[model samples]
Every structure is written in C-alpha cells, then in structure tokens.
Target: PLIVPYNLPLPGGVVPRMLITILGTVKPNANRIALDFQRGNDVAFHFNPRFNENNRRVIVCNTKLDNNWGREERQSVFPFESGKPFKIQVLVEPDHFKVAVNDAHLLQYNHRVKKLNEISKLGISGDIDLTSASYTMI
Candidate 1:
C-alpha cells in the first residue's frame, strides 16, 4: 500500500548522527518523484527525480525556504531507473545530509535549515511505489 504523500515521524526529532533508509520502486512511467525532510511547512532537504530529457538524466538535490525552492544541485551520475527498485540512505551531519542510492555514494546537501532539530518528519511522494520507510539514531 502506498500513500500519495507518505508521512513518517521522527521520535526524538533529527538528532546528530541519525541514519535512515528509503526504499521504493519507480513507477513504470514515472515522470517525477521526490522525498522531503520537513518541519511543519518548511522543508530542509529535497531529493527529486525528474525525467530530464534535456540532460538525458534525472536527479536533483536542493532545499526550500519561505516556501521558495532554491537553486538545484545536480549529480553527473544518476542512479534511478524506471520500473526498478531503489535504496536511498541518508546520513545527518552537522553541516550536511549525505545521500547514497543503490548502496553507492550520491551527493550531499548543505543544511539549509541550519537548526537541524527542526527537521521532525520525512515525506515521500510522487510517481513511485513506496515499500518501506524506517530510521534509527546512530
């Protein structure tokens, strides 16, 4: 079962050294998909995948502020494939969020919402079948 926008709570908020794994499969015709690190209405980290025809790839990393999307950060390597399952691991550092997809290193986003603790929830949405979402304090 998949919720359009799946929501999961962080028991003690996002403390230092926390780790999480997001596992999902891209829909056969997935045009776009995203995972957000949220606090109330503010989003800290945003990992998005869009069928970028121009670049011949799809993958973007960024953040939101005042409900505005910031400039996107792109990776030369793209790990997601339509109709295929993916595993994403995120590690919370004092200054950035490190990500890995399919057990390979992806990219890191500098903490835009510097208050780290404010990140209390994780949201998953769009064009994908979410199988499981879980996290633990490390």
Candidate 2:
C-alpha cells in the first residue's frame, strides 16, 4: 500500500454538535497516523494515533492556533491495529471535541480556539494507507 493524504472539505464550515467521519486503513508497516481539522491557515483540532512512537502505545492531541503550537495532550491504550481498516468519528461540542473509533469511545479534546464554525478544512496524513474521509451536514 502507498502512503498518501486525503482532505475533506466542510462546505458550511464546522458547527456546534456537528459530526465528522473519517475512514482509513493501516498499512502493513504502519508507524503513525494523523488527522487535522483546520481553517484556511489554522488548525483547530489535531488528532494523531502513533503506533511506534513510544513503546508501541501513544496517542497525542494538540492544536495549532495564533501561529503557534499549543501544549500536547498524551494518552495511551492505543486502539489501532496494523493493516486493518478503521472508522473515526469526531463530534463537535460547545467546548470540546468528542472522538470515537470503530464504535468505541476513544478520547476528547478541549476546544483551543473555541470557535466552532471557523474550520473550513479537514485532512488525514501520515504512514497509513488512506481509504476516504467524508461528512454530511445536518
């Protein structure tokens, strides 16, 4: 499999209580996977699952705003399998983002900019083989 990046455009931008869905498959030699929700030149939420970062168990959450990188949030109990398909759902809330993986609750990230509708883009990158990323407005 080849490594590539896929982007999902949110036509109406992101709103409170909105849901974002991403689908992808890990490569046989997966090292890391990254997902970013951003505006034209800013990142609101950056979610990444690292398989070989630190002892084969690490997940880091962070955001880039105001032209600077914010503090990192780290968590464990990694829920990704190499060479397997995955479904990740992100829910926008008033103050934070809720994330789920393969029908299981994974983690939450507090709002960095706290402006929901400012996001205009979503992208997935890193060492995995991308399948697709899609979303529907409600």
Candidate 3:
C-alpha cells in the first residue's frame, strides 16, 4: 500500500533535540519528491530532491510564509538511488534543521519561521513509496 500525499499532525509540535525520520524507496522512474514541515497554511521548511533524468540531480530547501516562497538553497548532490531503500533524518536544532540521508550528513536549513512549535504538521509527497514518517525526542 502507498499514499502519495501523506500528511501527519505532530502530537507535540517540534522542539530542539527532536529527530524526524522518513523511510522510503525511490521508484525507478522517479523525478522529484518533497518533505515539508508545516502549519495550517505556511510551510516552515521544504525539502525537495529532484532527479533530472539526463540533466542534474539536485536537492532544494526553502521556506514558505504567507503563501510566498523564500530563497531556495540548492545542492548538487544525489545521495538517493533509484529502486533502493533510503532513510532521511532531520534533527531539529535551536536555529537550524540538520538533515541526513542514509545516515550520512547531507545539509542544514536555517530557521525561517522562528517559532518551532508553529510547525505542527509533516507532509510527504511525490515519486516514492514511503514506509514510515515519524518523530521522536532525544
């Protein structure tokens, strides 16, 4: 069973020392996927990975406020493999979100929506078969 646009409400919101984990497998014909930390209408952090078939593989991070998107932080690294399982971990820190792929450090996105608790939802979508998405405190 698979759900493309899966959204979960966080029980306690987010705080420092919290870890958000996502486990999934990229489809063979995948093009792009996105993970987001959200509130009712605003997105605190947006994590997107693009597999540009013959072009470039990139990861994009950004924030959205009041329906407006912020500047994108793009990276040219492709850590995900098509048809293979992958793990994504997002460690919530005071000022930024540290992200790791397959247990390896990937990148960090600075806090744009200052208050962490405002982000009470987790969203996942696009070309992957998601196994689980969870969060725990350390």
**All candidates' lDDT scores?**
0.84, 0.80, 0.89
What are the per-model C-alpha RMSD values against the true structure? 1.5, 2.1, 1.4
Selected candidate, larger TM-score, 1 vs 3: 3
- Assess every candidate by TM-score: 0.91, 0.89, 0.94
- For model 2, residues 1-138, the per-residue Cα lDDT tens digits are 323677777876788768887777888988888888897677888888888775666898988877787899988867889888888888877788889999898998888776666688888898776666667554
Worst 10 residues of 2 by lDDT: 129-138
Considering every candidate listed, which one attains the maximal lDDT? Answer: 3
Model 3, CA-based lDDT: 0.89
- Give the runs in model 2 whose Cα sits over 4 Å from its true position: 1-3
Q: Residue-wise lDDT of candidate 3 within 50-90, one digit each (tens)?
A: 99836889998998889999899998877988888999999
Off by more than 4 A, model 3: none
Better of 2 and 3 by TM-score: 3
For model 1, the superposed segments whose C-alpha errors exceed 4 Å read 53-55
